[PDB]
Structure formats: C-alpha cells, structure tokens
Design a protein around this ligand. Structure first.
Ligand SMILES: O=C(O)[C@H]1[C@@H]2CN(c3ncnc4[nH]c5cc(F)ccc5c34)CC[C@@H]21
Length: 167
C-alpha cells in the first residue's frame, strides 16, 4: 500500500490520473518523480519548466553543476538528482523530441530507465512539447515498464482520450 490516490488502474503495474505532476508531487512526496528532461537539463518549459519553477530554480542550479561535471545526457538516457521540495529524488529522463527529429524508437530506451525504481510518479515521456503521440507513449510505457508507475496527465481532455482508447 502506498499513498497515491484517485488513480485508474490500466494494468498490473501502470496507473493513470488527471493531475498536475507538480501538485501531485508536493502532496505525495514520492520517492521518485520523473522529469521530461532534455540532454542539457535546460528546464525551460513543459513538465521540466513547471517542475523547476516549483523548486524556485534549485533544480536548474543543481542540473547546471551536473552538466558542467558530466556533460550532456544521451537521448534515451537518464540521471538521478535531488527531488528538492517535490520528491526524494528526481529521475531526469530524456525521451526523443520529435520537434528535433529524434528517433521515436528511443522512447522504449527512455522508459527502460523507470525499471531501476520500484515506484515512480511520472509524465508520459515524449508527450506535450516533445511532440510524440501520447497514446503511443502510453502503449510503450505499458509494454516496457515493469515497476509501479503512476502517470500524471495534466490535460483532462487528453486523459479521457488515453483511458477511453486504452487496449
Ligand atoms: O512536453 C512537455 O513539456 C510536457 C507536456 C505536458 N506534460 C505534463 N504532464 C503532466 N503534468 C504536467 N504539469 C504541467 C505543467 C506545465 F506548466 C506544463 C506541462 C505540464 C505537465 C507532459 C507531456 C508534455
């Protein structure tokens, strides 16, 4: 038993809700919140910009030190950093950005990072400003992640579409 509430159960291990991941994060204090990061950890907009704003830019300050030491992530890759006031940890995961021409097959590799964590609060990778089809992203999530994932979907309309079309 964990503290996530109001989720719809899609599979043995995948759950979905219409929620603002920032507000869900501040209420659950999950062990892991996933950020929809880019390779430079430049948290300017989308989920990343919202999450970073909620940390009063501390996420960005920590991320800039990470990049200065380690260089950029790979598309499909991840790193674990602090969750600041939102979670114990933030798993920054880079899905392919269709608006940059990145290969959508990397979406599976991106979701594989979730399997290193027993429970996660996450957005749909490569959705939103990353330009992928959120229904495809949900399918890849369900077919790739084996750990317990709680998907927060900001847009109510999108959600109702994700649920109603889920096979
Ligand atoms: O590509 C993106 O950046 C994310 C678009 C929407 N994404 C979100 N998904 C769950 N919770 C969310 N809260 C937000 C608050 C915001 F100001 C902005 C976005 C989000 C958001 C994920 C898919 C894609």
């Amino acid at each position: 038993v964990n503290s996530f509430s109001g989720y719809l159960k899609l599979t043995d291990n995948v759950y979905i809700k219409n929620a603002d991941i920032v507000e869900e994060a501040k209420k659950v204090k999950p062990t892991v919140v996933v950020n929809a990061a880019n390779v430079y950890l430049k948290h300017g907009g989308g989920v990343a910009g919202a999450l970073n704003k909620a940390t009063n830019n501390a996420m960005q300050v920590e991320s800039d030190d990470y990049i200065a030491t380690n260089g950029p992530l790979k598309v499909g890759g991840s790193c674990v950093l602090s969750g600041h006031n939102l979670a114990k940890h933030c798993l920054h995961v880079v899905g392919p950005n269709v608006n940059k021409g990145e290969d959508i097959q990397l979406l599976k590799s991106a979701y594989e990072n979730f399997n290193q964590h027993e429970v996660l609060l996450a957005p749909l990778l490569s959705a939103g400003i990353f330009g992928a089809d959120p229904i495809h992203s949900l399918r890849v999530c369900v077919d790739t992640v084996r750990t317990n994932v709680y998907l927060a979907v900001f847009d109510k309309n999108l959600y109702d579409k994700l649920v109603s079309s889920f096979l």
